[PDB]
Structure 1
Amino acid sequence: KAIPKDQRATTPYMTKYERARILGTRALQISMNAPVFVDLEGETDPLRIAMKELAEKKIPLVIRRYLPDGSFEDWSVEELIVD
């Protein structure tokens, strides 16, 4: 039931599975034209553009991590340390 931030016990690193999914999802949205938050270098491929955002943490998503009890944490993809 949405453990509060002070009590969030999980790994602040972004598991590869997460990074994979967020990439896919964001890239999909981008392909569907949802606004892009980073100035392109001339990029075209959405998946590239997605990674380009992920580097700068401009991706505006939030991960809901279900614990086995049924509860969850919500980490913002911007606060998760990556790599």
Structure 2
Amino acid sequence: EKAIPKDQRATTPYMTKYERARILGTRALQISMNAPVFVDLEGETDPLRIAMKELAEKKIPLVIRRYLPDGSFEDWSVEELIVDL
């Protein structure tokens, strides 16, 4: 119920440090448990060091749901988001 339509740019297109970190973390928790990786490992084996390469290739299947005080919220996929910092 009541979710801000695809458009209407009310927030940042850029990724907050707390989003990026939290995402990296979440993939890192899947990479750790023999879950499929969606990148060719260049010869690395650390779930946190990996997820970083999954982030560069932009192939992490996660959607940030950003919350606005009133109760409404926005959805940004890790395709849409810019990783700058």
TM-score (norm 1): 0.95
Matched-pair identity in %: 100
Range 26-35 or range 59-68, more displaced: 26-35
Q: Deviations over 1:15-67 (max 9, x none)?
A: 00000000000111111122111000111111000001011110010000010
Query: Which structure 2 segments of 5+ residues have no match?
Result: none
Superposition RMSD in Å: 0.8
User: 1:14, 1:82 within 8 Å by CA — same for their partners in 2?
Assistant: yes
CA distance in 2 between partners of 1:40 and 1:46 (Å): 11
CA distance in 2 between partners of 1:80 and 1:9 (Å): 14
Partner of 1:40: 41
Deviating 4+ runs (over 2 angstroms) = none
Alpha-carbon deviation of 1:8?
3.4
User: 1:13, 1:80 within 8 Å by CA — same for their partners in 2?
Assistant: yes
**Number of matched pairs:** 83
Query: Which structure 1 segments of 5+ residues have no match?
Result: none
Partner of 1:54: 55
